[PDB]
Amino acid sequence: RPSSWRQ
Amino acid sequence: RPSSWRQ
Amino acid sequence: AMGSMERASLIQKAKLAEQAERYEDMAAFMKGAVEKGEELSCEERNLLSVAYKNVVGGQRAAWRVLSSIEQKSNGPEVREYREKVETELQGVCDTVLGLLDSHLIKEAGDAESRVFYLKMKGDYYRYLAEVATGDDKKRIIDSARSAYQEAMDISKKEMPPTNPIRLGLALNFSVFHYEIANSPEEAISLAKTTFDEAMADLHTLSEDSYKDSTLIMQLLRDNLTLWT
Amino acid sequence: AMGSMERASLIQKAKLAEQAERYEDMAAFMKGAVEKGEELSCEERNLLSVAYKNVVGGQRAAWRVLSSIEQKSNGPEVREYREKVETELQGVCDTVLGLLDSHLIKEAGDAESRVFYLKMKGDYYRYLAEVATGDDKKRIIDSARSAYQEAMDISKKEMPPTNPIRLGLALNFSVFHYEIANSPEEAISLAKTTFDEAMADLHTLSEDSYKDSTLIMQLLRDNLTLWT
Ligand SMILES: *Cc1ccc(-n2ccnc2-c2ccccc2)cc1C
Ligand SMILES: *Cc1ccc(-n2ccnc2-c2ccccc2)cc1C
Ligand SMILES: [Ca+2]
Ligand SMILES: [Ca+2]
Ligand SMILES: [Cl-]
Ligand SMILES: [Cl-]
């Protein structure tokens, strides 16, 4: 559910 | 550009 | 590669792959199921079609991106990579057409199965035609036309005008006329006649069948709006 | 399989594959470029990362769908197919980790390259940890932690608090703490300290660098909002 790095 | 069959 | 898996397990895994959006897996599972040699049910035919339509749809989208880059450029790399994708697309189309020819179509006796498979045959020859340029492009186009035409003849004799397979076949044959055969008037006439005859048959349908049919009629209308 | 293609052509084709959203091709091209044995530029490192992140991202999404179906069920098919996808995911992670270990990391002397590769090493051990269950899961987790930690130590010594690689590393290490190491307080503290120290360094940046840094700071804030 959490955000890791993404463009 | 035109639509063929799709779900 | 699927020869050792049970038919029912291949079908079950095709459905799981669809839920996982793993369409290459889905196609390989359904290819294995076809190669068991038994006819396919209505649901199984839909799984086969969904799997390969998504695989080839990604290849077509990629080919169009690369072909567009290639045209703006005209080293060898863009052409080489477009050719790679094009060859992979042709291989998938050949695989599908081989399944239809060995031996789905010849064992398909009911209108719903036979029309479904002939529509598929027209579709995958159409995808081959989208990338064709050599001495066989005219024959590829005529192969698509011939498959679509046989499907149309059966559908008009055996199915009501609102039948979803009949509607989707007419939709795709109209796209063939417009995009492939350079016959936009034939495309428009087919889409219009198909829409109007289905409209006049909607009164016979249940609420659920009405929803199925009007959904595809909307795609016919979308194309007519684009084309006129 | 890419040994006969020029390094520059592999890089050019990686960029074309990205435009075509053909990320498996993109990864194979960038793998071939790495195997040429030369160090990678900043742009080339980004191509490598984008390619494998998209490939493994699709595998992770599929694995989560299948693992969820499997848990609701608990024949062998759902487990078997989850295992198939899991094995394919592990193979891609092993491939990336093998590229980092042979020999990207040992030749990476600059902070920007070394931190980038160590972040990747932490990420792909993290993806292995997401599916791990056997006797090696603790060692996999410690391998991720150790790579992230070395990257953090270098980034804090050598990079400003707004550096995008430093920010993305801290973001992903915080996700590691929350999701993998069951250390939500460590995750929250790291995200908060990272956000606050970057905020206090924004005044040093150009408009373009400001946009780069604040974009990743927003992901830190999104997680803090989810976690608190
Ligand atoms: C080519 C095509 C046209 C229509 C449909 N479709 C839409 C709604 N229901 C169906 C259907 C259902 C069972 C069997 C065949 C078609 C699907 C396709 C692939
Ligand atoms: C893991 C990661 C963090 C940040 C970035 N990123 C965002 C904006 N610019 C960059 C960047 C640019 C050049 C080199 C490294 C990072 C990208 C990634 C993959
Ligand atoms: Ca039969
Ligand atoms: Ca070096
Ligand atoms: Cl190529
Ligand atoms: Cl399997």
For chain C, which chains pass the contact test of at least 3 CB pairs under 8 Å?
B, D
- Of the candidates C50, C10, C16, C49, the residue with the CA atom closest to the CA atom of residue C28: C10
Mark yes or no for CB contact D175/A4 under 8 Å.
Answer: yes
Cα(C60)–Cα(C53) distance, rounded to whole angstroms?
A: 10
Q: Which architecture, in CATH terms, is D7-228?
A: Up-down Bundle (1.20)
Q: Which residues lie closer than 8 Å to D216 by C-beta, 6 or more apart?
A: A5, D164, D167, D168, D171
Ligand 2 center from residue C87 Cα (angstroms): 34
Indicate which residue's Cα is closest to atom 18 of ligand 2: D165
DSSP 3-state percent helix, strand, coil across chain A (nearest 5)? 0, 0, 100
Nearest CB to D171 within list A1, A5, A7: A5
C155 lines ligand 1 (CB under 6 A): no
Q: Is C212 left (phi over 0), alpha (psi -120 to 50) or beta?
A: alpha
Cα(D144)–Cα(D142) distance, rounded to whole angstroms?
A: 5
Sequence letter at residue D44? E
Nearest CB to D62 within list C20, C75, C80: C20
Q: Which residues of D touch A6 (CB under 8 A)?
A: 219
What was the resolution (in A) of this experimentally determined structure?
A: 1.8
Chain D: nearest CA to C164, how far in angstroms? 30
Chains A and D touch (3+ CB pairs under 8 A): yes
* B5 Cα nearest atom in ligand 1: 1
Chain A residues contacting D via beta carbons under 8 Å: 1-7
Mark yes or no for CB contact C22/D85 under 8 Å.
Answer: yes
Spell out the domain ranges in chain D: 7-228
Residue C179 carries which DSSP code?
I
Q: Which residues lie closer than 8 Å to D113 by C-beta, 6 or more apart?
A: D39, D40, D42, D45
Q: Which residues of D touch A7 (CB under 8 A)?
A: 50
Indicate which residue's Cα is closest to atom 15 of ligand 1: C165
CA angle D129/D132/D133 to nearest 5° reads: 140
Mark yes or no for CB contact A2/D178 under 8 Å.
Answer: yes
Q: Which residues lie closer than 8 Å to A1 by C-beta, 6 or more apart?
A: D226
User: CA-nearest residue of chain A to D174?
Assistant: A4
Identify how many contiguous H helices and E strands chain D contains and give both numbers.
10, 0
- Of the candidates C137, C59, C47, C133, the residue with the CA atom closest to the CA atom of residue C93: C59
Burial code (b: 16+ CB inside 10 Å, e: under 16) for C110-148 equals: ebbbbbbbbbbbbbbbbbbbbbbeeeeeeebbebbbebb
Indicate which residue's Cα is closest to atom 15 of ligand 2: D165
Ligand 5 center from residue C84 Cα (angstroms): 5
